[PDB]
Structure formats: structure tokens, C-alpha cells
Amino acid sequence: MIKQRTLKRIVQATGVGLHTGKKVTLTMRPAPANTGVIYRRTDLNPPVDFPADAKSVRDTMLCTCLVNEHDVRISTVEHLNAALAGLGIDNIIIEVNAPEVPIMDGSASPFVYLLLDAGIEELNSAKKFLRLKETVRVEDGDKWAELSPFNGFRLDFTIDFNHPAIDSSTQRYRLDFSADSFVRQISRARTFGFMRDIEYLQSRGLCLGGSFDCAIVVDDYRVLNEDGLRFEDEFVRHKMLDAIGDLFMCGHNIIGAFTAYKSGHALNNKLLQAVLAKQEAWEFVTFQDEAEMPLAFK
Numbered sequence: 001m002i003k004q005r006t007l008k009r010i011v012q013a014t015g016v017g018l019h020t021g022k023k024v025t026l027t028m029r030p031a032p033a034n035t036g037v038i039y040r041r042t043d044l045n046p047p048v049d050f051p052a053d054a055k056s057v058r059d060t061m062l063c064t065c066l067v068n069e070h071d072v073r074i075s076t077v078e079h080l081n082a083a084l085a086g087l088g089i090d091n092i093i094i095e096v097n098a099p100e101v102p103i104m105d106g107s108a109s110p111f112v113y114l115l116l117d118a119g120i121e122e123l124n125s126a127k128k129f130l131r132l133k134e135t136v137r138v139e140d141g142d143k144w145a146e147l148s149p150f151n152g153f154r155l156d157f158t159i160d161f162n163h164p165a166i167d168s169s170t171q172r173y174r175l176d177f178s179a180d181s182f183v184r185q186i187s188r189a190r191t192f193g194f195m196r197d198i199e200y201l202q203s204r205g206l207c208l209g210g211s212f213d214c215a216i217v218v219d220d221y222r223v224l225n226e227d228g229l230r231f232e233d234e235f236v237r238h239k240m241l242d243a244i245g246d247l248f249m250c251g252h253n254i255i256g257a258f259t260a261y262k263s264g265h266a267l268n269n270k271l272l273q274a275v276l277a278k279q280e281a282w283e284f285v286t287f288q289d290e291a292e293m294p295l296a297f298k
């Protein structure tokens with residue numbers, strides 16, 4: 001039986017939210033089989049829970065933000081979600097005492113590290129995977145995103161920035177997803193902002209926690225960060241990280257192929273919901289033979 005995974009230990013990190021700029025403590029706790037991924041605002045009385053569900057994602061392109069009927073929020077969950085997806089975590093309580101997940105270094109790597117420190121516990125219940133049986137595609141203008149059948153998890157992401165700082169040959173990345181390949185190739189890729197966009201968002205009271213320590217900053221002509229990039233193609237890798245985290249809002253690892261061009265948080269969420277809404281396009285599956293399981297998590 002391929003088993004559900006949670007943490008062995010409670011772990012904690014403190015940081016600041018990228019957009020709120022608020023100091024926040026993140027606490028991640030083990031949880032029982034069939035619990036799922038739950039996010040909690042613990043600064044409110046009573047505390048407020050959110051599930052990992054595509055429908056709890058706020059209507060915005062800025063980030064992936066959880067919101068409830070009362071407009072209580074947990075902003076910027078995409079990078080932490082990518083780490084959870086990457087290590088195949090099924091059950092976990094994620095607590096924050098402020099309206100945003102800390103940005104840390106802008107990548108998913110700090111979350112990978114914390115999850116590894118917390119240890120992985122395999123539980124006595126079958127891990128369910130969401131397996132694609134048909135192809136589903138969504139579009140927004142020139143943007144598009146697709147999920148199709150594939151025995152594993154393949155991602156193919158293309159960006160098209162027409163920016164002097166981002167060479168044309170570095171704008172596509174393809175990945176056969178495993179915990180190993182995610183951690184090694186994707187997890188360290190940092191978020192980025194263009195100055196034009198940063199100014200726009202700053203003007204609107206956003207990016208309050210933005211800094212060179214948490215983001216690649218690109219001006220009109222070049223990356224401004226002194227020591228450059230972690231990868232020559234760090235930008236497209238980060239867009240892939242975002243997609244991994246966004247798709248994980250359903251709380252299951254997917255078996256299929258994700259292919260996308262300029263897809264951001266809104267379109268990734270649109271795709272997820274479009275898949276879920278077409279019953280014929282997917283199914284939940286479980287496995288018994290470890291030696292042939294489609295996805296490898298360590």
C-alpha cells in the first residue's frame with residue numbers, strides 16, 4: 001500500500017509576509033490520516049480554518065490567497081504549497097498568526113527544509129492521487145494551461161517576457177516530477193518582480209515586505225540583485241514552482257502532464273476547477289506495488 005504522509009514533529013519558523021509586510025510565525029503540525037491540508041489563522045478568536053480546496057482561492061492574479069465568506073484571508077500560500085506537493089504531504093495543519101505566509105527567501109526551499117526537519121510519517125491509510133483521464137485546457141487571452149493523461153507528473157512551462165534581462169533561450173523548462181527532481185531543480189527558484197509592476201503594487205499598498213533578500217528584482221534593463229541568479233533559467237523554474245503549488249490547492253498529488261504558457265495563479269486555479277468540474281476527465285486512484293508507483297517521494 002502506498003501510504004498517506006504527515007509530519008513526525010511540530011516545526012516553527014518566523015518571517016514576514018511579502019505583501020502585508022507583517023511579522024508572522026508559521027507553525028506546521030502533524031495530523032491524522034484523511035485529515036487533508038488545513039490552514040489556520042490562530043491570531044483570531046475563534047481561530048479560522050481553511051481547507052486546501054480550489055474554491056477557497058481568492059479572485060486575484062497577485063498570489064494564491066485563501067479567503068472565506070467573511071473575507072478573512074491567508075495570503076501567498078503557493079510556495080509553501082509547492083513544498084508540500086513536492087514531498088507528497090497529505091495531512092498537515094499549517095498555522096499562521098497573521099494574514100500571510102512568510103515569504104522567507106522567496107522560494108520553496110526554506111519550507112522543504114522545515115518539512116524535512118519535522119520528519120515524514122507514513123500513516124496506515126492509502127494515499128489517493130488525482131489521475132487525469134482526459135485533456136482539459138483553459139485560456140485567458142494569450143495565456144493557456146492544460147492537464148492531460150500521463151503515467152507520472154510531467155510539467156512543461158513556457159514564459160515570454162520580451163525583457164532584456166531574460167534571455168530568449170531560458171524561457172522554457174520541462175520536468176519529470178519526483179521529490180528528488182523537485183527539491184534539486186525547482187525548490188530553490190525565487191519569486192521575481194519587475195520594477196514597473198513593483199511600483200504599481202507599492203502604489204496600491206502592496207509589496208510591503210518586498211526586499212532583495214526575498215525576491216529577484218528586475219528593472220527596465222537588468223536584474224538588480226548583486227549576486228545574480230541561482231539558475232540561468234530561474235524565472236521559468238519559479239513559474240513552474242507556482243504551478244505546482246497552485247495545483248496542490250486540491251490537496252492531492254496529480255498523475256498527468258501539465259503544459260502551460262504564461263499561466264499565473266488565476267489561470268492555474270481556473271484549470272484546476274475546470275478539471276474537477278468534468279467528472280469524466282479524472283479519477284482518484286491508489287497503489288500497492290511500491291516498485292512501480294508513478295510518483296516517487298523518497
Ligand SMILES: C[C@@H](O)[C@H](NC(=O)c1ccc(C#Cc2ccc(CN3CCOCC3)cc2)cc1)C(=O)NO
Nearest residue numbers: 062063078191192193198207210211212215217242
Ligand atoms: C511574478 C511572480 O513570480 C509572483 N511574484 C510577484 O508577483 C511579486 C514578487 C516580488 C515582488 C517584490 C518586491 C520588492 C523587492 C525589493 C524592494 C526594495 N527595493 C528597493 C530599491 O529599489 C528596488 C526595490 C521592494 C519590493 C512583487 C511582486 C509570485 O511568485 N507569485 O507566487
Ligand SMILES: [Zn+2]
Nearest residue numbers: 078191238242
Ligand atoms: Zn511564486
